């Protein structure tokens, strides 16, 4: 269940002269209810 605190927004960045900047934000987050509930299998040859 990927939990997003800050949804994608749109704002302006620091001074940029006449560049007319734009910036989008977010907040990375992921929760795993129980570790052994999901498994992983890496690849390897003989």
């Amino acid at each position: 269940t990927q939990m997003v605190l800050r949804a994608p927004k749109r704002t302006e960045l620091a001074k940029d002269g006449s560049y007319e900047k734009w910036m989008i934000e977010m907040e990375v987050g992921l929760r795993h209810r129980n570790p052994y509930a999901s498994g992983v299998l890496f690849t390897a040859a003989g």
Binding site: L13, A14, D16, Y19, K21
Partner: protein
């Protein structure tokens, strides 16, 4: 126009003020037309014959 390449691992400080980020422009793909022609010439006697 395509999008950016594989992103990720671009860890940056909150107040880093990145270098305006990157991006890629578009591309123009041009072609050309072609003319197809067909001629026909028939006499009036042959146009009237049954």
């Amino acid at each position: 126009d395509a999008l950016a390449s594989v992103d990720g691992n671009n860890a940056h400080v909150e107040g880093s003020r990145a270098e305006d980020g990157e991006m890629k422009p578009t591309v123009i793909k041009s072609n050309v037309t072609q003319i197809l022609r067909k001629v026909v010439r028939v006499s009036d006697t042959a146009n009237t014959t049954a």
